[PDB]
Amino acid sequence: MENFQKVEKIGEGTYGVVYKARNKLTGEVVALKKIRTEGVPSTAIREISLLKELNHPNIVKLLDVIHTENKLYLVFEFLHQDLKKFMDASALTGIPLPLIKSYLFQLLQGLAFCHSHRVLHRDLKPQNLLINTEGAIKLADFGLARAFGVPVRTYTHEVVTLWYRAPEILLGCKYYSTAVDIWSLGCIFAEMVTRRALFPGDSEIDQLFRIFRTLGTPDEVVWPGVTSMPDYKPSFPKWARQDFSKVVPPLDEDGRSLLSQMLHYDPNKRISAKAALAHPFFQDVTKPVPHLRL
Template identity: 45%
Template sequence: MSKEINERYKRLENLGEGTYGVVSKALDKKLNRYVAIKKIKMDVTNEGISCSSLREISALSDLKHENIVNLLEIYNNGRSLYLVFEFCDSDLQKFIKNFEGDIPLTTIKNILQQLIKALSYCHSHRTYHRDIKPGNVFMNNDGTIKLGDFGLSRVFRSESKHFTPEVISLWYRAPEILLKMPSYTSAVDMWSVGTILGELILKRPLFCGKSEQEQITQIFDLLGVPNERNWPGVNKYYHFTHDPDAPVPIDFNSHFSRIGKEGTSLLKSLLMYNPDDRMSAEKALAHPFFNC
């Protein structure tokens, strides 16, 4: 760490390393609290600060919500950029992996509701997250959820603009992005929420393709092959052929029966093929699932 960082923070352990930087747990010696520090190396000969870092800084400087991770400080020593975040005890990926037995329905509701609240706030402030996955949903031991990692986020002026398809981890990627449609909306985040709900129920990823084609196939196996009736215009972007040996889509209600009628209703609404029909974050918060 730089001298200024070392004077303020005591590094405790490495929490992980990603594409853009190394994250460490540290003690804020001034305020006697734990923080997470992301160190990002700067390319002084080329672009300087990465687009991902700029997006994260921009988003978290504007988005202040109880279910969004708080960016506390920014340090720049000319060689590295240090982003200081509030510390969270774990993340949803580790929680699902380490939880013994079925996750209780009340816990699923609590996690999902907080995540959707964070997204409702983001979308109302014209921000797509574009990388919703369990590893980016942080958790504290008291059950509080914090949405983080806004490196792929994007502020939009209007819906349905042309954005890059190189977003969202494959297993949580919406079908409109997988099929290379030229535009998408905040509905891509809600598809990801649906896949997380499925993962919380099954204790494994809902879709886990090794390629985009395999991912698409797994989605079709669960939801059936889309058509012009349930997704107008889809045939312009994907050539569907009838395969007599293709598996019949599973019985959705029985597969997810543990969450009851209202739960499967919400899950279906989040996994609608047509983005225009997919439930928004604001409407999802009012779904009866959270009151039953």
């Protein structure tokens, strides 16, 4: 738009292009996202305008919504790097546990806040977790999945990742809960520790089976109601549960106990963000500053 000088393209998102731009009136650098056609649904207009209100230090702020000339642009506060880049940079040494613990703790604060307002992300992944020089980490694109249903292929045909998707979603459950975000967070948590994706599926069935091989094929004992799920099939291979010590070495007992609670099959059993902040694993959390070169 006119009130903004595009400085550069930051990337090819799920919904559209993302540019770093300078607001000519405030002079502030901002993240400008062009979204996605019949003349923009008023329902999406209302969903988004509600997000303008839930502000938290661990949530990327939605500064403005520009629906000019039947087009939609969302203006978000700008952050320099995402967790995905940072992990690729700390591949050799790994991210230090104190930083891992600080980031998970902040993430859970942002989640607890949104969840208390009944707002889900539904599409958590490293790429939408943004970090700054002072040791902060913020959740980006919160609530947009609800406003604009998460696509299979992005506008540039990029296949959207299934890696962090909760099993109830993969089994065709249509009424997701806040528990889906906890599952995603547990997957990212494991990835930060081992420096390898936990369940890197390349199809919905492959993703489902990767989950089954590790956590064991679910049944009516661990997940009551599972066999009645829309896409559940009695013909699923029956796999045994692997030991967490083998799944996430060298995570200590507290971290492994926490992860196991975030990875419970049954959504009603899965630990809540608010409950997780009180877990012993956070007893010694601090706020270290990351080693990020811009």
